[PDB]
Structures are given as C-alpha cells and as structure tokens.
Design a protein around this ligand. Structure first.
Ligand code: BEF
Ligand SMILES: [Mg+2]
Ligand code: NA
Length: 219
C-alpha cells in the first residue's frame, strides 16, 4: 500500500484563487489600469507573480523600471496576505478533512507539497497542522513545477521515496511534477487541462482513502 500522500494546497485543500484575483484587481485599480476583471484573471492562473504583473502592465502598454516592477509585485503580495487573514476551517474543501483523518488513522504519512509560501499559515488558519507530518519549504527548492522538486522534498521529509507516494494536484505543471518525482498523480479537474494519461477526479469529494487505495492497486 502507498505510504504517503503529498498534498498540493491551492485547488486541493482550499481555494486561494479569489484572494489572488481580488489582490490583482485592487492593484490595477490603484495604478489606473482598466480591464482586470474575472475573465482576464483566467490568464493569470498558474502564471508566476511577475509574469502576471507583466500581463496587467501590458493592458495599458505600461513601462516601468525594475525597481518599480518589484514594488508593484510587493504591493500585490501585501494585498493578498491581508486578504487571507480570515481563512478558516469552513474553507477546507469537501472530503479533505475526512481524508486527512483516515490517512492518519491508517498510519499513512501526510506531507504538504505546495508552491505556497503561506502554506504553514494557511494550514494553521484551517486547523489542519496537526495532520501534517511535514511541510516541504518552497523557498528551499531549486525549481518550481513542472520540476519535481517540491514533491521529492515532501516525500523525503516524511521518510519515504516518491515511488511509495500519491500526489494530489489541480494544475497541469503540478501533475507533471508529480509524475517526474516518481509518485503516482491523481488530479482534480479535467483532462483537457491535466492530461488523459493520469487518473483525474471532478472535485475533491472524490479524494477518499478507499478511492486512493483503488487507484494504487490498479497501478
Ligand atoms: F498549493 Be499548490 F502549489 F496549488
Ligand atoms: Mg494547486
Ligand atoms: Na507534525
């Protein structure tokens, strides 16, 4: 049986996307750039902070210095950190707490394998820290998804090889990271986005211990 589950955070445990969107929209309003609406924001999903800021500047053909650019990115981050202050246990996605409980009951290791530099804070706000055996630090990896680094780190931190692990992700690059780590990916979303060569569930209510066991045994 698999010995660990490596959890992405955003799109798996909870959603932070609304806060990212509102942070960008607030910054755009402050600097007088029109057009940062919900539809535009779809172009910022899975994109780096810096590439997202550039997309926003491009809406107004705005040119800035490196120092100005750094400051705008900082202001967006400040916005986001303020906006996540009221995250709560009610924000945990369906099924996830029961999955954590069932994994713990069955002595299966639980690691956070998230790109979020706010992972520990968010798990505290959601009252989930006690379930986690480790949090891989995204500040300590050399490369971000689709590189496998955070998933290798997470597996190692709970004393397992990635090959003994399942990874859960909502992003295409994240799925590729899991695959390349050696862990077994189970995506949440649709194959158009994630690929058709992995098991995918439509939403997190399908992430149950019984389902993960079924997937593992099929493999
Ligand atoms: F928290 Be994962 F990087 F979406
Ligand atoms: Mg995610
Ligand atoms: Na712990």
């Amino acid at each position: 049986m698999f010995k660990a589950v490596l959890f992405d955070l955003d799109g798996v445990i909870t959603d932070t996307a609304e806060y990212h969107f509102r942070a960008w929209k607030a910054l755009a309003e402050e600097i007088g750039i029109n057009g940062v609406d919900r539809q535009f924001n779809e172009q910022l999903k899975g994109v780096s902070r810096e590439d997202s800021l550039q997309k926003i500047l491009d809406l107004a053909d705005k040119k800035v210095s490196a120092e100005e650019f750094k400051e705008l990115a900082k202001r967006k981050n400040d916005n986001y950190v303020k906006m996540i202050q009221d995250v709560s246990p009610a924000d945990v996605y369906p099924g996830i707490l029961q999955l954590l409980k069932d994994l713990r009951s069955n002595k299966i290791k639980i690691a956070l394998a998230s790109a979020s530099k706010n992972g520990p804070f968010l798990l505290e706000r959601m009252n989930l820290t006690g379930y986690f055996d480790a949090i891989a630090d995204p500040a300590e990896v050399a490369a971000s998804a689709p590189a496998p680094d955070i998933f290798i780190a997470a597996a190692h931190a709970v004393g397992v090889a990635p090959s003994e692990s399942i990874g859960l992700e909502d992003s295409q690059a994240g799925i590729q990271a899991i695959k390349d780590s050696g862990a077994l990916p189970i995506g949440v979303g649709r194959p158009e986005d994630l690929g058709d060569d992995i098991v995918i569930v439509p939403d997190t209510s399908h992430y149950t211990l019984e389902f993960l066991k079924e997937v593992w045994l099929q493999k």
